[PDB]
Amino acid sequence: AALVIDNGSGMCKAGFAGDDAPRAVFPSIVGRPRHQGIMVGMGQKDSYVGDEAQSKRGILTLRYPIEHGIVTNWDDMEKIWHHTFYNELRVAPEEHPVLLTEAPMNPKSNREKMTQIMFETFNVPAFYVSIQAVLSLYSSGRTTGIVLDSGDGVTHVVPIYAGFSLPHAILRIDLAGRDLTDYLMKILSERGYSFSTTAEREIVRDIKEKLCYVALDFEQEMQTAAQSSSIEKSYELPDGQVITIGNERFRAPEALFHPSVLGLESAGIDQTTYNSIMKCDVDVRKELYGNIVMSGGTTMFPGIAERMQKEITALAPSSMKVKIIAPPERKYSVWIGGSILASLTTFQQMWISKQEYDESGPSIVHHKCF
Amino acid sequence: AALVIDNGSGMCKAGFAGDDAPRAVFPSIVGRPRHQGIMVGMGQKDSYVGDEAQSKRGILTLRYPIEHGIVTNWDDMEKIWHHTFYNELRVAPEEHPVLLTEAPMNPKSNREKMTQIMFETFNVPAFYVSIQAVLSLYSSGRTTGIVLDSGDGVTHVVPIYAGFSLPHAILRIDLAGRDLTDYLMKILSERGYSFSTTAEREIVRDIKEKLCYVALDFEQEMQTAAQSSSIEKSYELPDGQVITIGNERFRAPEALFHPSVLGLESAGIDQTTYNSIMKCDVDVRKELYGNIVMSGGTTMFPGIAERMQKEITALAPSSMKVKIIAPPERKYSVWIGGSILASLTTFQQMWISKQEYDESGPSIVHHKCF
Amino acid sequence: AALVIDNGSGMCKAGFAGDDAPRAVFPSIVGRPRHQGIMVGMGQKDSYVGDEAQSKRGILTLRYPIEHGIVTNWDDMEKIWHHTFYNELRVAPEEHPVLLTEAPMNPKSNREKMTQIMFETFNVPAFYVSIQAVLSLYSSGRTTGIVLDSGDGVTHVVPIYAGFSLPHAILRIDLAGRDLTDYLMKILSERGYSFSTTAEREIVRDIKEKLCYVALDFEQEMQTAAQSSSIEKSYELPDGQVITIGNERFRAPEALFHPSVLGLESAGIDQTTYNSIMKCDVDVRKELYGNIVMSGGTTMFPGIAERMQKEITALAPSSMKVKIIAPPERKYSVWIGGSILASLTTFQQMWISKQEYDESGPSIVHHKCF
Amino acid sequence: AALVIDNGSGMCKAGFAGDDAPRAVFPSIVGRPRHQGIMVGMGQKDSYVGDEAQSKRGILTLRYPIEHGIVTNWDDMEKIWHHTFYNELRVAPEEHPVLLTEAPMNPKSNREKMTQIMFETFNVPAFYVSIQAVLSLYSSGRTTGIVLDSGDGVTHVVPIYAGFSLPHAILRIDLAGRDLTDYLMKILSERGYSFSTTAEREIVRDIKEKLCYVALDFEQEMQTAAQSSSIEKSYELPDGQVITIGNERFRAPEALFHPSVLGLESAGIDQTTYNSIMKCDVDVRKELYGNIVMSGGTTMFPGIAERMQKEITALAPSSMKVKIIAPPERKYSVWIGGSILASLTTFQQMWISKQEYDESGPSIVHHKCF
Amino acid sequence: AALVIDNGSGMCKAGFAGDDAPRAVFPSIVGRPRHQGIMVGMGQKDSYVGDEAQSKRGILTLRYPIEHGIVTNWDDMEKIWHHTFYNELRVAPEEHPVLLTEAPMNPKSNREKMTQIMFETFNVPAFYVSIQAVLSLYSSGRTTGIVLDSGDGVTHVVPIYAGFSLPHAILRIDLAGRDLTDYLMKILSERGYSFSTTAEREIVRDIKEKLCYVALDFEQEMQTAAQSSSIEKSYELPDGQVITIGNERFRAPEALFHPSVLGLESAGIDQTTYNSIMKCDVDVRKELYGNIVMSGGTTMFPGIAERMQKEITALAPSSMKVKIIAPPERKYSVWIGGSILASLTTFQQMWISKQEYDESGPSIVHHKCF
Ligand SMILES: Nc1ncnc2c1ncn2[C@@H]1O[C@H](COP(=O)(O)OP(=O)(O)O)[C@@H](O)[C@H]1O
Ligand SMILES: Nc1ncnc2c1ncn2[C@@H]1O[C@H](COP(=O)(O)OP(=O)(O)O)[C@@H](O)[C@H]1O
Ligand SMILES: Nc1ncnc2c1ncn2[C@@H]1O[C@H](COP(=O)(O)OP(=O)(O)O)[C@@H](O)[C@H]1O
Ligand SMILES: Nc1ncnc2c1ncn2[C@@H]1O[C@H](COP(=O)(O)OP(=O)(O)O)[C@@H](O)[C@H]1O
Ligand SMILES: Nc1ncnc2c1ncn2[C@@H]1O[C@H](COP(=O)(O)OP(=O)(O)O)[C@@H](O)[C@H]1O
Ligand SMILES: [Mg+2]
Ligand SMILES: [Mg+2]
Ligand SMILES: [Mg+2]
Ligand SMILES: [Mg+2]
Ligand SMILES: [Mg+2]
């Protein structure tokens, strides 16, 4: 059986095919020491990965080797896969085909470089790469739908109808978990919590994943926050400091619908979604107002689905069955879908083999991999 | 018992002989994918037919393999019969003689090619082809009359008297449901509804079949539309958009009487009808001002019969019994007539047999088939 | 003397009648601030036009008020004419009749609204609107020809014979400079150049207008680009970044002949042209294979005329004198033609006057304006 | 005429509006006695300010009530304004509107508390607060630029284009005169000069402001200092001790470009500047590689501008007009700008009045003050 | 095996590596005669060391050649090592590598001079110097912690996390056993015990090391001493005089938390500790509120750990696991740690060799020694 890796921008997710739940999950980041290891007595190393990285942030600089789905640092990137194979899953990569994922319309160079690394350094027997949305759709068995995947690095809308892509209406957005965290960090610095080290950035991420939520009406909840204590929940900073976060718990996520606050010209996810639907033929729009499938951790806010519902119903003509699907498997949907795909017999012919790569090398992927 | 297929230009109609109602009806069109089927997991196909085609327009290009009664794409055409036999009626074509239909004066090549396909690929035991008008006349039992058949592809006038054809006065016209739909599409694009994909073309057809009607006086109803809301009915586009169509609901059908609007030099159906009557001997004109029988879906507009009545009475001398017959079976008249013909015992000698075709092949048909 | 404005979808062109060259040219766009003007000391404004807009893209959102020849934003549209009169040409609109242009079969509402604005707010003494193709034909003095006008917003084919229109064969296409720019933006994002702000969109337009060209054989030049450096010219992004564009320099324009790449079902300009010719009577087709006149900036690619020649000669029967005319005045042809028309004495009776509009208002235009 | 106070983190600067030069300058610090005043005969006091503080350091503890632009000690802070009004300028605060300044993105509480103090205790008639960068830009009349302000407490980069802020690209850094002094104190303690009382800290500041300079190449000048006397200039400690400072004269300022030496993860001013430029749209980057305006005393090192030039030109693409502007008015630029702003007539409507504050109190400022 | 010397400011501690207990301990002081040795008959000498010095204080002047970790008198300093090698341990220094210790941030000159003396005059085969805190941490095996070392000459706080130093948060204080003894001498002189010869100073040290203790509440125990006999313990001066010491038994040590009494501006050890913790990143503060390790004889007061606990818990946020570790090995911790370090095999490559010193001399140490 093959092996599935999502290579999520923010947190790698990996496991054996045919499993409904990912075995291994960890932050797709590396740790580099910035301080002198003068305590010779200990077996220190120049690099750290995942959990170890999280445990040592204050010693380390943190770098995300994936930005906006772009591998900007191949050397450190290799360590993520290296750890995933040799330490985490303890799997010989020569023994299994492997599946990878990428952002749509991602720069063609990187897919080649990725394939090169897989076939050369890990010497995998066979390989394939799929667009995340397709897998995430398989995770719900539907074959008519529109996917919002919103990982740490990108948010993109892909329509799929009866198993066909409509690439002319693929649309992507730079807003994602990372930049949303950056904005949250900014507004928190109107309180004393000014953070801004790469170490503290990761703690803001935790705070967001714990305590943020999406308002059904921005002016309503802003009024309530101006006029009540009740929103101003506490949180325990690791040093035991008590931070109180008010409207910011929602004023941040609001960016996904009014990105102008974040100074991005591109519209929010809802508006982009409507645009993409409208870019498709009128023959299909019905089914694409159904089957709005959320995916990825940025869809893990509470309330977000309701806001999307309300906005889309405000944009669509009435008497249209606007329906949003937000399964609780959202955070692992991509990997679930990949696990499903790898089990199909017919798909077993889809793999690119060692022989094929040897025949034409990386360029071959553009001919079959989608 | 034999089997009857109309092979209508726009929608195939098929069933067993001796039935007063056609069993199977579907659009005589094929669907070709234009977009990549990257969702391997699903069992997609390269071709679609009829209902499936209608259900997937936005994925597909649509092609009518019949134009103006001419089979321009024999390969895709074969699929229509193929579906009709094997899926729709679930009938072995070796077990039944089959009846087909054609436009009058249709190009002699195609009748041969059709016969070749029937006897070679479907290997039918016996075969015959009849001019649509004759069948449509049998559908009303009359044997003195003049038929207007106006399918999707052609409109033609055939007089028949006491069972005899008058081929010297056969007259055909290129105006038909398809080109009338095209014109309707044009004028709608003076509003925002500009459509013009092959997918949307089919929706214009539905709109026409739902909402168009024929004016008894063009200047009258144009004045009223200029001076009232009441004509400007709504329609629900499949995407839930609300389109409001005004005078266009009739300004389109008007083309059948003033084709100059459509830029065709040939006169309208009424004028052509009068011309054809006048081309016959004065011995018969009486009976041919009676027994104007409408046929085919373009005669399915409301009001059309009244307009024809008024025009013909304006052309004919007064004190002539201009009478128009518009049975509600219009839309299926051709197939009804064919079903009737196939039941006659004497007609059972009319069939061309496997033996006869083997004797002389396709050319044989010109000797007996009319 | 009257005044001529093209109101081109992408760039307004204006000047006095009787001039062979347009006096004033600027992008028909408005600029809206998205960022806070906290530097009170400066006299900022809420709106910007043309050159000012180009100079401030990074501050501004850009909106084209013309899409597909449709004025979708009348309020901002008014500013374009307002600037054109009061700042650019410095002309009192009460002192001169004015000529405007529109796409063929453009939605009838907008012509009325335009006339209303001209006679009410600008209070022009007299007014007329002409279809762009007719003017562009006058620009070459011919009176038998077929025009391809391909502005930023639309591309449409109009045949004209001896001064007569054949509206039944008018055909329009949504492909135009804007959507072609969008496609170019897409494929560039396979390299790192992902752009996609409304500001950067305008820079892609410049890049296209500088560096794109049409292949005489797609597979040939694709092979060469796969097998040579020589196509991969450089360009200097305004930030000094060096972008290298390869096959994309032509793979984009190719869309005009294989729009399926752009996911539009409608055929390319060549195929549409052949269709339109075939829609005309055989009496005229000879002259319409001559006198293929290019117009508008999308015809400003190098090589395009040759590709059209080769395609049309592949579609037409041989021994037909396929001839294409691509004067270097292409980019200003429409305005040139308008300048010519306004000088004719007989045309001076064609104008609609203040009196006439007062008599019947906007609806009057449909009776005389073509 | 209004009155302008910078409330600089390290040294208050104050004077009447419309003056090109600040009237009053003194260190924004308070002095508290730590030793018993047993010499009753003298009129001692529990508090000292500015010059008096400087004259008595050895008796006193010194506290900066401003840290990182944050007023951490409002009680002692009040004395700074109190002295400024009543002793220094000898001005009744009821007679003049007053202007104040703050760090960008400074914690929202403090702006309110400041306004409260101004309107309640000083009972000023009207008040306004501006971001330092904006004023410093007005000091050079430019309206396109990027400001580095680097006071004692903060260093922050703000881009401004044509008078518009781009808050999404505002970036701040904790490195500033104070912490740089602390580092200098540290390395001097590798020689005998170990200082580290709050009194001696102030003398290190003087030494820095007299004798430090920025290297154009760190390894070059380190080599020269390892291989020459010539850098090892003398200084006269107030007790007459002779201190010799070598490479430290530059190894300290180097921190602003390699803060890792100071153990801050955030990059240097140059890198941050490039990041901020890149955060702006490509429409404006050209003008922001021009008009790099230095401000505040940390930009008062010799050589710093050249180092910035070299670094930025190393980061920017070549053929970009990297230009740095370092007017000799740097040390007073903020106050100059404020003096200019207060003279503008239109700005006279910008003030918040006693009435407005009474209407809504401190919260009002967030609605108008930027 | 190598040899370990602490060169403690107040008492040298020396022995062979790999021993858990130091072999040799004596006061790091020299004795110089001030009185005429007229009793020729005896073999007197001009110098005395350690025990001999203690036995002859009344004849001698005593000088500490180490002050604040600074070797101020290299000539007399040499005798300490000279005695340590040749008399005390009876070891040839050519036969063993030797380890030394220094205060953090100690003036760079002295480390060089020390190395020079070791390699030149003692001609040791190999040498290394380590910061005291690191060794003292190894003495407890921990590798996350913060060390308070408080010898006779200095008290300094060093954080270490997972074996990494955070030099940016190293902080040192001049308060130490010597100056605390001086203060105790002062307050005793409010009783008759005015001492103040360099001889008597040493007896005050003994009294302190015997009879002082730290109050858990200063005002509490001051009240009790004002209201009870019970604190006023006796001591036997060497001349048999009976001295009674009351609150002074604690009013002295209190200086370490309220140094203002000693007229030092720098805060106490607790406050400095909190400051240092706060100077580290929030990623690590948790572990640094644990693992407060005491070291050196000034941590040998009873009660001190409890006072530190109470203060730190008063400064830290509650629900933080403030834990203090005060092993009874405190007084010898540094030497224990050094003994441990010298046994590690990997450390055996850390030594500087005779060859290396010969290559570059003293300056070499700054490249490897930490
Ligand atoms: N409960 C949550 N609430 C808000 N944001 C979350 C939550 N869980 C995860 N996230 C965000 O989603 C990111 C991961 O999303 P994911 O789809 O896994 O991206 P990728 O697939 O590229 O790793 C996290 O880093 C975080 O920013
Ligand atoms: N109710 C209706 N109103 C107007 N047009 C109709 C209606 N019903 C059918 N049509 C037109 O008639 C066409 C079919 O006519 P038909 O006689 O079946 O042609 P064919 O026999 O060649 O299939 C339809 O495609 C449509 O354009
Ligand atoms: N040299 C060129 N090469 C390619 N495209 C061009 C060139 N010049 C102009 N264009 C395209 O043509 C557009 C303008 O064409 P135009 O006919 O003026 O449209 P309109 O008349 O509606 O303004 C430009 O915005 C650009 O997209
Ligand atoms: N000539 C100089 N060289 C180096 N540093 C200087 C010089 N002059 C001033 N400084 C530093 O700049 C600080 C004051 O800068 P300033 O911009 O006034 O800060 P603020 O505006 O917050 O008072 C001084 O305290 C000192 O540290
Ligand atoms: N039991 C004790 N109580 C109080 N102070 C002590 C005690 N033991 C030692 N000291 C103080 O600690 C000093 C020695 O501490 P130490 O850490 O050895 O300094 P160094 O390491 O520099 O020699 C002694 O000189 C004395 O002042
Ligand atoms: Mg993912
Ligand atoms: Mg039919
Ligand atoms: Mg134009
Ligand atoms: Mg300042
Ligand atoms: Mg010691």
PDB file of N, CA, C and O in Angstrom, chain D residues 178-196:
ATOM      1  N   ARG D 178      18.435  53.777  23.836  1.00  0.00           N
ATOM      2  CA  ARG D 178      18.628  53.268  25.187  1.00  0.00           C
ATOM      3  C   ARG D 178      19.283  51.893  25.179  1.00  0.00           C
ATOM      4  O   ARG D 178      20.336  51.689  25.793  1.00  0.00           O
ATOM      5  N   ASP D 179      18.664  50.926  24.513  1.00  0.00           N
ATOM      6  CA  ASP D 179      19.220  49.581  24.520  1.00  0.00           C
ATOM      7  C   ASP D 179      20.577  49.528  23.836  1.00  0.00           C
ATOM      8  O   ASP D 179      21.452  48.746  24.234  1.00  0.00           O
ATOM      9  N   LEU D 180      20.789  50.376  22.834  1.00  0.00           N
ATOM     10  CA  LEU D 180      22.106  50.464  22.222  1.00  0.00           C
ATOM     11  C   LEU D 180      23.136  50.995  23.201  1.00  0.00           C
ATOM     12  O   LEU D 180      24.275  50.513  23.247  1.00  0.00           O
ATOM     13  N   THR D 181      22.728  51.933  24.045  1.00  0.00           N
ATOM     14  CA  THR D 181      23.599  52.379  25.117  1.00  0.00           C
ATOM     15  C   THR D 181      23.903  51.245  26.074  1.00  0.00           C
ATOM     16  O   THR D 181      25.035  51.104  26.547  1.00  0.00           O
ATOM     17  N   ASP D 182      22.892  50.456  26.403  1.00  0.00           N
ATOM     18  CA  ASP D 182      23.107  49.334  27.306  1.00  0.00           C
ATOM     19  C   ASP D 182      24.145  48.376  26.747  1.00  0.00           C
ATOM     20  O   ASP D 182      25.061  47.944  27.460  1.00  0.00           O
ATOM     21  N   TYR D 183      24.042  48.066  25.459  1.00  0.00           N
ATOM     22  CA  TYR D 183      25.037  47.199  24.845  1.00  0.00           C
ATOM     23  C   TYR D 183      26.415  47.825  24.903  1.00  0.00           C
ATOM     24  O   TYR D 183      27.399  47.150  25.221  1.00  0.00           O
ATOM     25  N   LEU D 184      26.509  49.117  24.606  1.00  0.00           N
ATOM     26  CA  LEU D 184      27.814  49.762  24.663  1.00  0.00           C
ATOM     27  C   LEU D 184      28.390  49.656  26.062  1.00  0.00           C
ATOM     28  O   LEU D 184      29.581  49.380  26.240  1.00  0.00           O
ATOM     29  N   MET D 185      27.544  49.858  27.066  1.00  0.00           N
ATOM     30  CA  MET D 185      27.968  49.696  28.447  1.00  0.00           C
ATOM     31  C   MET D 185      28.517  48.304  28.684  1.00  0.00           C
ATOM     32  O   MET D 185      29.544  48.132  29.346  1.00  0.00           O
ATOM     33  N   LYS D 186      27.854  47.296  28.130  1.00  0.00           N
ATOM     34  CA  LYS D 186      28.327  45.934  28.315  1.00  0.00           C
ATOM     35  C   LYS D 186      29.739  45.747  27.783  1.00  0.00           C
ATOM     36  O   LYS D 186      30.636  45.316  28.516  1.00  0.00           O
ATOM     37  N   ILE D 187      29.972  46.094  26.520  1.00  0.00           N
ATOM     38  CA  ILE D 187      31.272  45.781  25.943  1.00  0.00           C
ATOM     39  C   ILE D 187      32.373  46.612  26.579  1.00  0.00           C
ATOM     40  O   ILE D 187      33.505  46.140  26.728  1.00  0.00           O
ATOM     41  N   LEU D 188      32.067  47.841  26.995  1.00  0.00           N
ATOM     42  CA  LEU D 188      33.047  48.614  27.746  1.00  0.00           C
ATOM     43  C   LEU D 188      33.483  47.917  29.019  1.00  0.00           C
ATOM     44  O   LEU D 188      34.604  48.128  29.491  1.00  0.00           O
ATOM     45  N   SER D 189      32.628  47.080  29.581  1.00  0.00           N
ATOM     46  CA  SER D 189      32.972  46.366  30.796  1.00  0.00           C
ATOM     47  C   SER D 189      33.880  45.188  30.540  1.00  0.00           C
ATOM     48  O   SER D 189      34.189  44.448  31.477  1.00  0.00           O
ATOM     49  N   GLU D 190      34.322  45.004  29.308  1.00  0.00           N
ATOM     50  CA  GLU D 190      35.463  44.144  29.076  1.00  0.00           C
ATOM     51  C   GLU D 190      36.772  44.864  29.378  1.00  0.00           C
ATOM     52  O   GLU D 190      37.757  44.222  29.752  1.00  0.00           O
ATOM     53  N   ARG D 191      36.825  46.171  29.161  1.00  0.00           N
ATOM     54  CA  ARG D 191      37.735  47.041  29.887  1.00  0.00           C
ATOM     55  C   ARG D 191      37.179  47.290  31.290  1.00  0.00           C
ATOM     56  O   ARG D 191      36.122  46.780  31.669  1.00  0.00           O
ATOM     57  N   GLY D 192      37.896  48.089  32.076  1.00  0.00           N
ATOM     58  CA  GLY D 192      37.587  48.264  33.483  1.00  0.00           C
ATOM     59  C   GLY D 192      36.392  49.128  33.794  1.00  0.00           C
ATOM     60  O   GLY D 192      36.047  49.305  34.964  1.00  0.00           O
ATOM     61  N   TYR D 193      35.741  49.666  32.774  1.00  0.00           N
ATOM     62  CA  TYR D 193      34.864  50.826  32.908  1.00  0.00           C
ATOM     63  C   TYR D 193      33.450  50.439  33.311  1.00  0.00           C
ATOM     64  O   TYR D 193      32.475  50.932  32.751  1.00  0.00           O
ATOM     65  N   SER D 194      33.313  49.553  34.293  1.00  0.00           N
ATOM     66  CA  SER D 194      32.137  48.697  34.348  1.00  0.00           C
ATOM     67  C   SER D 194      30.845  49.441  34.655  1.00  0.00           C
ATOM     68  O   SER D 194      29.768  48.898  34.388  1.00  0.00           O
ATOM     69  N   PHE D 195      30.911  50.656  35.189  1.00  0.00           N
ATOM     70  CA  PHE D 195      29.743  51.544  35.261  1.00  0.00           C
ATOM     71  C   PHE D 195      28.565  50.754  35.835  1.00  0.00           C
ATOM     72  O   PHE D 195      28.714  50.117  36.886  1.00  0.00           O
ATOM     73  N   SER D 196      27.401  50.767  35.188  1.00  0.00           N
ATOM     74  CA  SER D 196      26.176  50.038  35.510  1.00  0.00           C
ATOM     75  C   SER D 196      25.304  50.639  36.606  1.00  0.00           C
ATOM     76  O   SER D 196      24.218  50.102  36.841  1.00  0.00           O
TER      77      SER D 196
END
